[PDB]
């Protein structure tokens, strides 16, 4: 399927144990997509002081359209030293590995895969 319904655990930035997906734009997008498929991906909501506490390159989920079955359609955009790879809508949050942190909420998304 071109899209997959996912429910992403929303993590507090200070709980996150693995603060990024890797060392290059291509690796982080690769790893983000693998963790999304494997159900091992968390979401951190972006506010003042969040991104400097995580590791670049960043992987964002961004709104790709204006929401089937409660799931916002999203796509992945990476960022490294202020340059984004991808073009999409509003940021819903930054993706990180999930390694058993307790979430505060779930974010229902329809991921363009």
Q: Distance between CA 112 and CA 64 in Å, rounded?
A: 8
Beta-strand relationship, 105-112 and 72-80: parallel
Q: Does residue 21 sit in helix, strand or coil? A: coil
67's tokens? 């929401």
Q: State which residues form the domain around 101.
A: 3-112
Q: Residue 60 maps to which CATH number? A: 2.30.30
Q: How many domains does the chain have?
A: 1
74-104 exposure pattern, b = at least 16 Cβ within 10 A, e = fewer: bbbbbbeeeeeeeebeebbbbbbbbeebebe
99's tokens? 């390694």
Residue 93 in contact with residue 108, Cβ under 8 Å?
no
26's tokens? 């291509």
Q: What resolution in angstrom units was achieved for this structure?
A: 1.6
CB contact set of 109 (below 8 Å; sequence gap of 6+): 5, 6, 7, 8, 61, 71, 72, 73, 74, 92
The backbone region for 47, taken as left when phi is positive above 0, alpha when psi lies in -120 to 50, beta otherwise, is beta
Strand partners, 20: none
Q: How were these coordinates obtained?
A: X-ray
Number of residues that make up the chain: 113
């Amino acid at each position: 399927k071109t899209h997959v319904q996912l429910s992403l655990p929303v993590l507090q930035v200070r709980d996150v144990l693995v603060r990024g997906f890797g060392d290059s734009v291509e690796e982080v997008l690769s790893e983000a997509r693998q963790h999304l498929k494997d159900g091992t991906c968390g979401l951190v909501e972006v506010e003042k002081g969040v991104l400097p506490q995580l590791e670049q390159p960043y992987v964002f989920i961004k709104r790709s359209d204006a929401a089937p079955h409660g799931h916002v359609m999203v796509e992945l955009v990476a960022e490294l030293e202020g340059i984004q790879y991808g073009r999409s809508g509003e940021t819903l949050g930054v993706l990180v590995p999930h390694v058993g942190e307790i979430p505060v909420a779930y974010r229902k998304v329809l991921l363009r895969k």
